[PDB]
Amino acid sequence: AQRLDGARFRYLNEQLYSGPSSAAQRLFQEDPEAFLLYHRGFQSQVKKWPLQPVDRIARDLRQRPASLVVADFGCGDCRLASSIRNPVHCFDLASLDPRVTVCDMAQVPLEDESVDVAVFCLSLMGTNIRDFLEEANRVLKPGGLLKVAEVSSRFEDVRTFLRAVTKLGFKIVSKDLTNSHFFLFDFQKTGPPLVGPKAQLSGLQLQPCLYK
Ligand SMILES: Nc1ncnc2c1ncn2[C@@H]1O[C@H](CSCC[C@H](N)C(=O)O)[C@@H](O)[C@H]1O
């Protein structure tokens, strides 16, 4: 049974990285128990990490004024919102928490330049990663902060990933590669994307997180 839930999780997990966000959204809409499975599995993984990226991100944000408006892109169970006093917009494909605004984070119900900080904490799952980051750019005020955490094994070439993100109107401010389980990148918004919506951007193609 325990071995089965993990097999199930590992299959679903691999599936979630393999398709566009529309696929993941449909799956969770039609099969909400799959969402429960995913998070049972995800929690079993992050429990064994000395420090979760949400907590590291919360620590960062607690050092800045709590008036900064945060968007948590792929918020899961909203530990970020629970950990900071900021206004935190919580977006995910399905809801484990009453603060969740259910949507594809490629298209969130916020105005342009409405947020100070966009967070992607282990959430850049679908193949259409460009969509997520462009939506982050849209909602971010000029000079706003983008924080990205992903498992390090997802990055076969950090250099090109960072280069591609820069093409979407961001500047790297710092990167923390010191945690053994994830890389954390802080970018600041310089403006709108500087490659048109028909440019290629291969640097964004990440490897799936396979949890060991
Ligand atoms: N396109 C999308 N739109 C909204 N949420 C998405 C999404 N793609 C992935 N997610 C969400 O991203 C989450 C990844 S697990 C990480 C959850 C949370 N940030 C934490 O650190 O605890 C899942 O809840 C998943 O449903």
CATH of residue 34's domain is: 1.10.10.2150
Q: Looking at the structure, do residues 66 and 28 belong to the same domain, yes or no?
A: no
Distance 113 CA to ligand 1 centre (A): 22
CATH number of the domain at 154, please: 3.40.50.150
Q: Looking at the structure, do residues 202 and 125 belong to the same domain, yes or no?
A: yes
Q: Which amino acid is at 120?
A: F
54 lines ligand 1 (CB under 6 A): yes
Q: Looking at the structure, do residues 124 and 46 belong to the same domain, yes or no?
A: no
Q: Which residues are within 8 A (CB) of 11 and not within 5 positions of it... i.e. 6 or more apart?
A: none
Resolution rounded to one decimal, in angstroms: 2.0
Distance 73 CA to ligand 1 centre (A): 7
Domain coverage including residue 88: 52-212
Ligand 1 pocket test, pick from 38, 79, 123, 183 with the greatest ligand atom count within 8 Å of Cβ, gives 123
Q: Are strands 115-121 and 70-73 parallel, antiparallel or unpaired?
A: parallel
Task: Please give the Cα distance from 41 to 8 (Å, whole number).
Answer: 9
Q: Looking at the structure, do residues 6 and 106 belong to the same domain, yes or no?
A: no
Flag whether 121 is marked binding.
Answer: yes
Give the torsion sign (CA, 25, 209, 162, 140). Answer: positive
Q: Looking at the structure, do residues 123 and 202 belong to the same domain, yes or no?
A: yes
Q: Looking at the structure, do residues 41 and 144 belong to the same domain, yes or no?
A: no
Neighbours of 191 (CB within 10 A): 12
Flag whether 39 is marked binding.
Answer: yes
Distance 72 CA to ligand 1 centre (A): 9
Method used to determine the 3D structure: X-ray
Give the torsion sign (CA, 116, 120, 125, 127). Answer: positive
Number of domains in the chain: 2
Q: Looking at the structure, do residues 42 and 80 belong to the same domain, yes or no?
A: no
> 3-state DSSP call for residue 199?
coil
Looking at residue 181, the DSSP 8-state letter turns out to be T
Q: What angle do CA 4, 75, 22 make, to 5 degrees?
A: 75
Task: Please give the Cα distance from 53 to 178 (Å, whole number).
Answer: 12
Q: Looking at the structure, do residues 46 and 61 belong to the same domain, yes or no?
A: no
Q: Looking at the structure, do residues 33 and 106 belong to the same domain, yes or no?
A: no
> If 0-12 CB within 10 Å is exposed, 13-18 middle and 19+ buried, where does residue 164 land?
buried
Structure tokens that stand for 128 in this block: 């259409």
Q: What is the DSSP string of 56-118?
A: HHHHHHHTS-TTS-EEEET-TT-HHHHH--S-EEEEESS-SSTTEEES-TTS-S--TT-EEEE
